Design a protein around this ligand. Sequence first.
Ligand SMILES: *[C@@H]1O[C@H](CO)[C@@H](O)[C@H](O)[C@H]1NC(C)=O
Ligand SMILES: *[C@@H]1O[C@H](CO)[C@@H](O)[C@H](O)[C@H]1NC(C)=O
Ligand SMILES: *[C@@H]1O[C@H](CO)[C@@H](O)[C@H](O)[C@H]1NC(C)=O
Ligand SMILES: *[C@@H]1O[C@H](CO)[C@@H](O)[C@H](O)[C@H]1NC(C)=O
Ligand SMILES: *[C@@H]1O[C@H](CO)[C@@H](O)[C@H](O)[C@H]1NC(C)=O
Lengths: 48, 414, 48, 97, 48, 96, 134
Amino acid sequence: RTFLLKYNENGTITDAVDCALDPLSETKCTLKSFTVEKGIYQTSNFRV
Amino acid sequence: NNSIAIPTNFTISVTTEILPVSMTKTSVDCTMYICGDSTECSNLLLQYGSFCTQLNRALTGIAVEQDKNTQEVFAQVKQIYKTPPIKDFGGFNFSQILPDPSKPSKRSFIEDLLFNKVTLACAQKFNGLTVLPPLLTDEMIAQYTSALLAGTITSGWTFGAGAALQIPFAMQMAYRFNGIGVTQNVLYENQKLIANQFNSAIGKIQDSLSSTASALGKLQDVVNQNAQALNTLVKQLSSNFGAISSVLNDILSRLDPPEAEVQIDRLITGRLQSLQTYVTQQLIRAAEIRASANLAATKMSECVLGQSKRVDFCGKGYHLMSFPQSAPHGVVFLHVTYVPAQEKNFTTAPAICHDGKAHFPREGVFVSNGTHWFVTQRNFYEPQIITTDNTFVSGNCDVVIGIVNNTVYDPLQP
Amino acid sequence: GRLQSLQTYVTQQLIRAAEIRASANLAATKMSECVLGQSKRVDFCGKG
Amino acid sequence: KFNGLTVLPPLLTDEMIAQYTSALLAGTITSGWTFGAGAALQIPFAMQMAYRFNGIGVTQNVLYENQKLIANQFNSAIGKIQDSLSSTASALGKLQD
Amino acid sequence: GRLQSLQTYVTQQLIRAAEIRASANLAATKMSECVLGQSKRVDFCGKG
Amino acid sequence: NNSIAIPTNFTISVTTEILPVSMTKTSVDCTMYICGDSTECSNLLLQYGSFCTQLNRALTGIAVEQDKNTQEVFAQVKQIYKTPPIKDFGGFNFSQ
Amino acid sequence: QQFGRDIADTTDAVRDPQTLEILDITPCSFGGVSVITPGTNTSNQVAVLYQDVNCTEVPVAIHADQLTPTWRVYSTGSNVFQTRAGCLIGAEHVNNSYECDIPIGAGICASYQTSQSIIAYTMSLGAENSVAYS
Ligand SMILES: *[C@@H]1O[C@H](CO)[C@@H](O)[C@H](O)[C@H]1NC(C)=O
Ligand SMILES: *[C@@H]1O[C@H](CO)[C@@H](O)[C@H](O)[C@H]1NC(C)=O
Ligand SMILES: *[C@@H]1O[C@H](CO)[C@@H](O)[C@H](O)[C@H]1NC(C)=O
Ligand SMILES: *[C@@H]1O[C@H](CO)[C@@H](O)[C@H](O)[C@H]1NC(C)=O
Ligand SMILES: *[C@@H]1O[C@H](CO)[C@@H](O)[C@H](O)[C@H]1NC(C)=O
């Protein structure tokens, strides 16, 4: 899996989001962020 | 020193002008173009940093700009106006430039001629290259223009400045001539004359575009550029870049992965150079259209929604108004311009001295048959009797060069 | 790989420089017309 | 020169460029604004000086009562171009770039 | 290396050519406004 | 509240404005540039697909477009005029 | 002949060495998948746009039968709408027309309007109006 973990100033991970649960989760790893304004995005295909 | 040229007649002229607005909508996927359905190839591409997340993002950035360009050119108004059913415009005929309600499409009579005058030719979608549909389909593109004519023709130019205000079309051009230096008495005495000439002007441009004369020269270039560049990208995949084969599947069936590290990478490096050039060349082409798109957008706000006093910015000649029409990957402007006709050889003089006082023209020129003097508008010969109402008194008679003696009729106590 | 890193950046910056350069000149054209005088053109210094 | 750099001549030679400027120079002087919008209309240049003042809100009478002063003053501004262009500090920076 | 040397020269030429187009169109618009007629735009044809 | 300014005289000044219209058209041929007078090197270039048949149209595309700039700026009149033999321009000396 | 080429110089049609039957070869990956999503801090339910697939070969083109069950949820169902830009799944079609805020393509947009769901519709070009001309 491709995991995107975000770290606070301490380094302890408070939340994590897997990028294969749904095509919504595919957007975050595609864009490398979480809090993004409303719009439309394209994600590279990853189904095998 | 004392010869002036004042036109004695006039003719109406309708020209055309083509300007691209949006170009072909293209997008390239990251992995599909370089190597499709090969998980052993994408691993090697991952070690070359983040190129396709830049190139596709840049290519996607064109798509946002291309849809925004059409919105800032065509969606200038926020209400879809409709032309009234009664086509009584004071002798003018407007059927050729308005959409036909009988047809199931909103494209007007001349837009069908324009849409087949230039073409676009699609089937190579398999190797990554795809075409995104435009935000505004051709049915909606014609709908914007139909409202824009429904505002300029019927509501004057006020619909571009707020709520639409109704006005006759005979009214509209009557004091629109007031913006080019001629009074409004010209049209009311020549409404029949200008109507047939204007209708024939629409007929003259209709036959030329319906013939074999290629007048849409600029539109074909932008379509070919967005077609030749893609085709070069299609053909470029057939080159080996010095490899033992131009197809990676054979190389995957030829060399072991320890021996394919050198072989495949040089293919990967070569094809990245091929794609980088396309994305680069797409940006300048998108930059040039955007410069023309703002030019089209400015002409939308200037050459249509009002009267522009800038010389030779909307067609050729004095500006009266324009008829925007839908075109594939662009817009067509029909500038209706005022052109002076043949003139008469007049003899002029700057001023008149009557009783030692100088009378200067308030508005117009001073012309003579050769013995008698008359005053008329600068851009149209309508001679008038020299009165104290059309002139004003200033200065003496020994300070202005070229002054001529003449009499002034006084009408207040005849 | 690093020269090609700079070749991508410099090309994009020059292209983006032209985007600002046309916009700045457009503002400058509006700067000499919309504020330093009264403008007669329609829908160039705002709606109406 | 070497290594495949070929310079094509311009489509319009420098001699013919000046004639278009000469045509525009005579067009601006003898016609004003008419020749750019249709048939050329001949008009005295003294008259054309007035009708541009009317386009900037200046009354027609200001030119005629001060025609002599403008004639000396307009040429002096023209004569100042040579002093502003023949100096060491050249003002033709944009073309030189 | 020579192709990359030639490619960056073509890219540099294309960027500069577009700026000449913007300048020429500004010159062309000036030619249609500053010379062939009278322009009421403030501070567009020189100062004043 | 009640102060306005109306000039009592005027000054006529001319200012020089500079704008480029076109530059020198350039063209590069890959046949002799990349591999100078060597037929054993051009065959390597032929294996690189079509770049140098794609760059030539780019430079020529510039040159064709730049020739349009010269005609777009200067060639906006359909007639060629000449000065009249007399030079009575109301006190203006235009011979410069 | 043994195989056919094209503009791309790719083998698109090959002849069977056994039955000598003319047949065509083409892949359909449609790797450009797009999702329409509001602000990520607003909601989790979204709509996914598929480009030029007609959404009748989705289980066949990608072999979703043997995939994870979460892919088959959006592969088929009653929430299927077909556009000129493709087949859109995950939105409720509405017969009204508003000034849309989310561009998708082919005149179809999306919004966040009411029980909450994302609605897709043909955009409204504006408020219809007429001028009392005579
Ligand atoms: C004005 O016209 C008259 C008539 O021909 C001429 O004699 C005179 O010289 C002209 N004025 C000037 C300044 O040349
Ligand atoms: C301006 O101010 C003066 C005194 O301060 C006052 O008399 C006058 O009415 C004012 N004018 C206006 C227009 O307010
Ligand atoms: C989501 O973020 C936006 C940021 O603009 C904010 O306006 C909105 O109130 C936020 N909503 C929630 C539910 O956090
Ligand atoms: C999509 O599938 C339906 C079902 O057979 C068919 O009627 C329709 O024509 C297909 N769409 C296209 C574009 O062929
Ligand atoms: C929209 O209209 C069509 C035809 O009038 C109808 O079949 C469809 O059910 C309508 N949709 C809704 C949600 O009512």
